[PDB]
Amino acid sequence: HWRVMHFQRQKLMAITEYIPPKPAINPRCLP
Amino acid sequence: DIARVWPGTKMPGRMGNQNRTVYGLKVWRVNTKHNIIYVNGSVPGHKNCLVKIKDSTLPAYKDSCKNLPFPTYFPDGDEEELPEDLFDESVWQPSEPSITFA
Amino acid sequence: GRTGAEHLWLTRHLKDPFVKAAKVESYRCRSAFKLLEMNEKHQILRPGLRVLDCGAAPGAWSQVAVQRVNATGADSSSPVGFVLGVDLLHIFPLAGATFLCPADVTDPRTFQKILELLPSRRADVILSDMAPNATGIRDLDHDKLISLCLTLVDMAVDILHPGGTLLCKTWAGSKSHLLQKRLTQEFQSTRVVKPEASRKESSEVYLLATQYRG
RNA sequence: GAGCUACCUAAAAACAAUUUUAUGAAUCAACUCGUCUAUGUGGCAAAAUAGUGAGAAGAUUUUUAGGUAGAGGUGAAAAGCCUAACGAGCUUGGUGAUAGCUGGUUACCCAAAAAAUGAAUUUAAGUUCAAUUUUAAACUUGCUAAAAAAACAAAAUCAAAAAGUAAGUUUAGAUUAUAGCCAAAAGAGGGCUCUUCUGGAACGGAAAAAACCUUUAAUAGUGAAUAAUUAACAACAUUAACCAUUGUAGGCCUAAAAGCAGCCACCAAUAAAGAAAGCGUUCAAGCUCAACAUAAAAUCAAAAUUCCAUAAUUUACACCAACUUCCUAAACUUAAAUUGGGUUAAUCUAUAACUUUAUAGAUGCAACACUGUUAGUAUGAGUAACAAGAAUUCCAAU
RNA sequence: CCGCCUGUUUACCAAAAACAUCACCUCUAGCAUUACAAGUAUUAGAGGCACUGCCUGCCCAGUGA
RNA sequence: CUCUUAUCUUUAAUCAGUGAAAUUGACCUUUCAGUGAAGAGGCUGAAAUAUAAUAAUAAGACGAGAAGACCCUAUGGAGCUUA
RNA sequence: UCGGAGAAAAUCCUCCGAAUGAUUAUAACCUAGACUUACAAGUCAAAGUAAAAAUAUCUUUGACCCAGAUAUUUUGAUCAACGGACCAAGUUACCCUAGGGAUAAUCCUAUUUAAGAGUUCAUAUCGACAAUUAGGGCUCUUGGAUCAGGACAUCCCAAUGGUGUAGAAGCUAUUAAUGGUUCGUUUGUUCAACGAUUAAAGUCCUACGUGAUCUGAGUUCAGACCGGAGCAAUCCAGGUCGGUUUCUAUCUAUUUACGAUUUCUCCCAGUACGAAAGGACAAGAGAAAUAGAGCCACCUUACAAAUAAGCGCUCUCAACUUAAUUUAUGAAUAAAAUCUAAAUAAAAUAUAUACGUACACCCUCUAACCUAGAGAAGGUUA
Numbered sequence A: 001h002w003r004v005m006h007f008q009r010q011k012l013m014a015i016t017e018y019i020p021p022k023p024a025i026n027p028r029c030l031p
Numbered sequence B: 001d002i003a004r005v006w007p008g009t010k011m012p013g014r015m016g017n018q019n020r021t022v023y024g025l026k027v028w029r030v031n032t033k034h035n036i037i038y039v040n041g042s043v044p045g046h047k048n049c050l051v052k053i054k055d056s057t058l059p060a061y062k063d064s065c066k067n068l069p070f071p072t073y074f075p076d077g078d079e080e081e082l083p084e085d086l087f088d089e090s091v092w093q094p095s096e097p098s099i100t101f102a
Numbered sequence C: 001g002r003t004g005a006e007h008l009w010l011t012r013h014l015k016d017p018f019v020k021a022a023k024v025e026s027y028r029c030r031s032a033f034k035l036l037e038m039n040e041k042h043q044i045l046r047p048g049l050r051v052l053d054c055g056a057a058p059g060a061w062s063q064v065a066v067q068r069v070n071a072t073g074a075d076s077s078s079p080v081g082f083v084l085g086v087d088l089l090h091i092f093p094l095a096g097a098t099f100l101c102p103a104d105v106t107d108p109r110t111f112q113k114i115l116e117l118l119p120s121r122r123a124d125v126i127l128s129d130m131a132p133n134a135t136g137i138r139d140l141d142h143d144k145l146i147s148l149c150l151t152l153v154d155m156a157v158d159i160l161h162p163g164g165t166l167l168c169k170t171w172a173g174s175k176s177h178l179l180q181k182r183l184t185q186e187f188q189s190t191r192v193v194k195p196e197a198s199r200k201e202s203s204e205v206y207l208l209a210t211q212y213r214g
Numbered sequence D: 001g002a003g004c005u006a007c008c009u010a011a012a013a014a015c016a017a018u019u020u021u022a023u024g025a026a027u028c029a030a031c032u033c034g035u036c037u038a039u040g041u042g043g044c045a046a047a048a049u050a051g052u053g054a055g056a057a058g059a060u061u062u063u064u065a066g067g068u069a070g071a072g073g074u075g076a077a078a079a080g081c082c083u084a085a086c087g088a089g090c091u092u093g094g095u096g097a098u099a100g101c102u103g104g105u106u107a108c109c110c111a112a113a114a115a116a117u118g119a120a121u122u123u124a125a126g127u128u129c130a131a132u133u134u135u136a137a138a139c140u141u142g143c144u145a146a147a148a149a150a151a152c153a154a155a156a157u158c159a160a161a162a163a164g165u166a167a168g169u170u171u172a173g174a175u176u177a178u179a180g181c182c183a184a185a186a187g188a189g190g191g192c193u194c195u196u197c198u199g200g201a202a203c204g205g206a207a208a209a210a211a212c213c214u215u216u217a218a219u220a221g222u223g224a225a226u227a228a229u230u231a232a233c234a235a236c237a238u239u240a241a242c243c244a245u246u247g248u249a250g251g252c253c254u255a256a257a258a259g260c261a262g263c264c265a266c267c268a269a270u271a272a273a274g275a276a277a278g279c280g281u282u283c284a285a286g287c288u289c290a291a292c293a294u295a296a297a298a299u300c301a302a303a304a305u306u307c308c309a310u311a312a313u314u315u316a317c318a319c320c321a322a323c324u325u326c327c328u329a330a331a332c333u334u335a336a337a338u339u340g341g342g343u344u345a346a347u348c349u350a351u352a353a354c355u356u357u358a359u360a361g362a363u364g365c366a367a368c369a370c371u372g373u374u375a376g377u378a379u380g381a382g383u384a385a386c387a388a389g390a391a392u393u394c395c396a397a398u
Numbered sequence E: 001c002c003g004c005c006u007g008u009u010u011a012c013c014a015a016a017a018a019c020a021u022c023a024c025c026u027c028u029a030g031c032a033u034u035a036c037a038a039g040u041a042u043u044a045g046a047g048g049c050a051c052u053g054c055c056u057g058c059c060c061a062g063u064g065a
Numbered sequence F: 001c002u003c004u005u006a007u008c009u010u011u012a013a014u015c016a017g018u019g020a021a022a023u024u025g026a027c028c029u030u031u032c033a034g035u036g037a038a039g040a041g042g043c044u045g046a047a048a049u050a051u052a053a054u055a056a057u058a059a060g061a062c063g064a065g066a067a068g069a070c071c072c073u074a075u076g077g078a079g080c081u082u083a
Numbered sequence G: 001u002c003g004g005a006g007a008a009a010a011u012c013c014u015c016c017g018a019a020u021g022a023u024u025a026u027a028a029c030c031u032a033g034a035c036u037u038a039c040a041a042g043u044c045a046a047a048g049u050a051a052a053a054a055u056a057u058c059u060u061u062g063a064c065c066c067a068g069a070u071a072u073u074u075u076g077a078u079c080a081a082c083g084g085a086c087c088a089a090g091u092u093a094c095c096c097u098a099g100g101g102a103u104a105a106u107c108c109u110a111u112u113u114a115a116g117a118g119u120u121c122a123u124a125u126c127g128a129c130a131a132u133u134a135g136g137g138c139u140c141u142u143g144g145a146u147c148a149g150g151a152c153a154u155c156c157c158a159a160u161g162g163u164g165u166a167g168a169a170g171c172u173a174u175u176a177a178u179g180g181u182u183c184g185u186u187u188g189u190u191c192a193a194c195g196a197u198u199a200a201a202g203u204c205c206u207a208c209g210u211g212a213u214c215u216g217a218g219u220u221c222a223g224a225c226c227g228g229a230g231c232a233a234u235c236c237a238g239g240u241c242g243g244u245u246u247c248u249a250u251c252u253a254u255u256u257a258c259g260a261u262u263u264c265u266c267c268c269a270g271u272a273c274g275a276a277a278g279g280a281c282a283a284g285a286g287a288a289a290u291a292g293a294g295c296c297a298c299c300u301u302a303c304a305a306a307u308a309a310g311c312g313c314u315c316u317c318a319a320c321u322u323a324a325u326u327u328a329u330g331a332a333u334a335a336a337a338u339c340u341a342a343a344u345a346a347a348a349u350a351u352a353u354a355c356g357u358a359c360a361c362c363c364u365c366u367a368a369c370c371u372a373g374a375g376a377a378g379g380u381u382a
């Protein structure tokens, strides 16, 4: 059981999640 | 809990005087002179009451109509005059000798 | 799933004062009280006597006897007494007692065992509490019980000592008169005793008869 | 007040038939009482009716008149009875008894405002004092902030100088209130229970929605820009192909324990083979693994009445939505006990006015609510319930 | 099982095992003109309690006597 | 009672006459799931649905009248017993 | 009541102590300014004056009134309920008024793990240590009758997988809510047991499902007894016997069809199977029992009526649409692989409405009659 988070706190977590950068070309399809 | 009465609840009310059907009654004998049919068992209603007769719709007797007159029976044709009384083989007719269970 | 009849029986058991009393006083069941109350008003049990208890199981009546006849022997001055228990069901051991379980009084071989073990082959008083399993037919259940009691009288000659007492548990019915006829002959007088602990709804009743002669 | 009832005094009265005897005997009417069941329950009746039951020549039942009176009487004691309601009658008066408890307490407008912490109390359903609030008055610094330098132990005091800003102290008068509720933090006794800091009481939003979120008062308009806003878009990312010879069955009470019970060693040949990684054999046999050549691929994660908006995978970065804010005209800012002020309905008097008015002086001066009082009329309802033997030539008739 | 018996009682939720009762026992009192009573210890008042027979009956001062 | 049935009288129903009582905030007075103070005819979301009488059943309207009982309080009472 | 220590400024939180005693070379009067504090009470102190040659250290009680003592100054409280009434205890079920309330552990089930049981062999059948955002159950309202609505965590009937499954019996697991699920009785048994049966005598939810439909205990009293207490009145979560709740329905809701379940005997056959002992499938036939719907030729019971009833008699059926499971063809994946949340073809519970039966008519009416009926409606008329 996880104690529920105040909706304001829940909004904070959603906006600060990790975002990875993505390459333009996938390595496998490259020579 | 429901705080109501279900529709269809069984309660006091007027009984009888409704259409009912009886299925699968055999025909034992026919009287051509007076147009009388003899049917096994009971039929709904009081005496002197009109009834509806039609051949059985039960699964077993699906196609027994072939032997019987197909459109209907016409005496106007007068191909042959019928006996006054028609019987079934198992029936023991009156005026026959007493039955001995030999 | 309990039917009304079953429910009514249990509630009577739960409110019973005597069942609570036995728990407090370390008695195996309510029955022991019936014997104690009867003993006070008739002094059937005294120190130094030899006692035979039939249908001991669970064994509550046996505990009453051992104290009274000084079977325990703790009171050195008091004359020691003997107690014996016979019942079809098993009896967990009790101090100062001998238990012949499983055995049926009707069987002959049981009788020979009883005679050898009993002191000097005779027992002053015989105590019987046996009742058959209740089928639920009044006459059938009553009849078998009367037959069981009558057989006990037949063997009473061999085991019972002159001047002895007999206490038997029975049910009322249409054959109670025969039981009176037999007991009258062997003993001088008989008493119909119903304890207060015995339940009012029950038809159970006891017979106390003393002074065995021939 | 003993015409009911309890007990007593005086004068009177009733008791069939049958069996016993010679009677608080027996059977059973009259008469007296009231066991058990059903009906009735605003009933025929504020204790009855229909059956069924107890006594019935006696401590029996019944009539008439008299007696005992409330700190009392009477009682074969039920704390029974004493005029339908007696653990102590009824009536009038003392009496507008008292009630820290329950219910009620009649026009408008403007303004301000609470906490419900501390102390004492036969006190905790109440009251007094502090503290708060408030109206008036005098005159001068207040609020936020606040360096260092202390006092503490290794954020609460304290308040220089400045800056943003308009309150603060003293004097006089006055009540009410003294139980809160939910959310979010930190603890303490172990979901409750206390203590401490912060916030809230929509007419919009979260499905309905006191306590979460957006929101400076309140006015007219068929204008406008915005705020919060239950939805969100099950796998992958060292192997699959072919095989197997031997020193010897390695020692070891283990018969034997042979790669495999152990138990120490664990070496040998051969391209390539562990005294064997498993099965399996009484032990052995037998099946595999790894070796021989020959090939190829390439970590966590998106239960009990009857289902419950309808639907939908791609058109280019916006739109819609609260008097929140702006616009024309105006206005000058945030539940409630209690507290400070401007008007006014009605009637009478003085003096005026003359189709119902003016200035003053007065009062039994204003009711959608007290199971309020009196009168009227509905609802239930044209319902529940109530009643007269027949014919004739007629009701003091046949 | 309880109570000896006929009787009585909570008018209007209790009729009984309760109350009374013959029998038995304890306590108080030697006396007249309004109760007791025109009475006098075999009498009167107050109270307790089933009767009947049947076991259990012991604070005489001890030993001699 | 297994296991209920038949008949007659009283009641009931229709016609004629007379004519009460408790009760009643207003009512244009529906079902299911959800919400909620074990609780919804009236609130949220779905669904159903021409208008009025006569005779019946008793699930709900926490149905009506209860002088109906258990727990607590008041510097409110009364009866009884005493040391 | 007061003081000291912890919690740390809360507590019915954890502990100890106090209602003094010892020593004193004897500690005066007067007076700025402060602490503490609701009030009351309680602390510290410069200067000045005076005695002497400045403070006694240990370190904690009680107002006012009212009575004392003496020669003017002093003394009186386990008022300890400690802000203190000058002086007063029990009991009430015989009771009254005003009101306020009310009326984690355990344990079993399901998942994960797998030492040891199972002669051998972890998972046929079980199963330690544990793991489970796992489910669900000193004390002090329930039964029964009537009628049932619903869940599946299935007791019986039905379709299937595995086995330490030869047959017959069994043990375990998956799917499915179809209708059913008996009759009597208490000597002992702390929420138990016994007799006879059945295909089976399932587990639960629905304010004890259900008391304006009925009824038995208890909650529980007014009378009366025993046992244990109290001087008594009385008392007890102790024994027993007796013992008062009425309702005329205003509103919602409701009151006129259906297409069946189970058991037994025979037959297959004393066969299959098995060393024997023993002992079945499926397919076919006949009997019953209960449930539903009707009827009166007979029998039986009534009206000592032409009718109504059961104890008498008759009739009861189809599956388009599936789930666990089992087969066939076949790629991803080189096959002779594979039932396929690949494209395809089949078989297979309980359910049910694709498919039928029943109903359909448009309607005169003074009145009389009726196997039609409360009223109304409906049927019949040389």
Ligand SMILES: Nc1ncnc2c1ncn2[C@@H]1O[C@H](CSCC[C@H](N)C(=O)O)[C@@H](O)[C@H]1O
Pocket: C031, C054, C055, C056, C057, C058, C059, C060, C061, C086, C087, C088, C089, C103, C104, C105, C106, C129, C130, C131, C132, C133, C148, G187, G188
């Ligand atoms: N004929 C008989 N022979 C022996 N024992 C018998 C018997 N009849 C009954 N019993 C036994 O006696 C007991 C009678 S029933 C229980 C009563 C118990 N003994 C009591 O004390 O109340 C049972 O244990 C029963 O098994």
Ligand SMILES: [Mg+2]
Pocket: B002, B003, B004
């Ligand atoms: Mg409903």
Ligand SMILES: [Mg+2]
Pocket: C201, C202, G186
């Ligand atoms: Mg019994």
Ligand SMILES: [Mg+2]
Pocket: none
């Ligand atoms: Mg009189």
Ligand SMILES: [Mg+2]
Pocket: none
């Ligand atoms: Mg009179």
Ligand SMILES: [Mg+2]
Pocket: none
């Ligand atoms: Mg006479």
Ligand SMILES: [Mg+2]
Pocket: none
């Ligand atoms: Mg009387």
Ligand SMILES: [Mg+2]
Pocket: none
């Ligand atoms: Mg008599």
Ligand SMILES: [Mg+2]
Pocket: none
């Ligand atoms: Mg008599």
Ligand SMILES: [Mg+2]
Pocket: none
């Ligand atoms: Mg007489």
Ligand SMILES: [Mg+2]
Pocket: none
């Ligand atoms: Mg009394």
Ligand SMILES: [Mg+2]
Pocket: none
């Ligand atoms: Mg009394």
Ligand SMILES: [Mg+2]
Pocket: none
């Ligand atoms: Mg009166």
Ligand SMILES: [Mg+2]
Pocket: none
């Ligand atoms: Mg007053």
Ligand SMILES: [Mg+2]
Pocket: D117
């Ligand atoms: Mg506060």
Ligand SMILES: [Mg+2]
Pocket: none
């Ligand atoms: Mg005081």
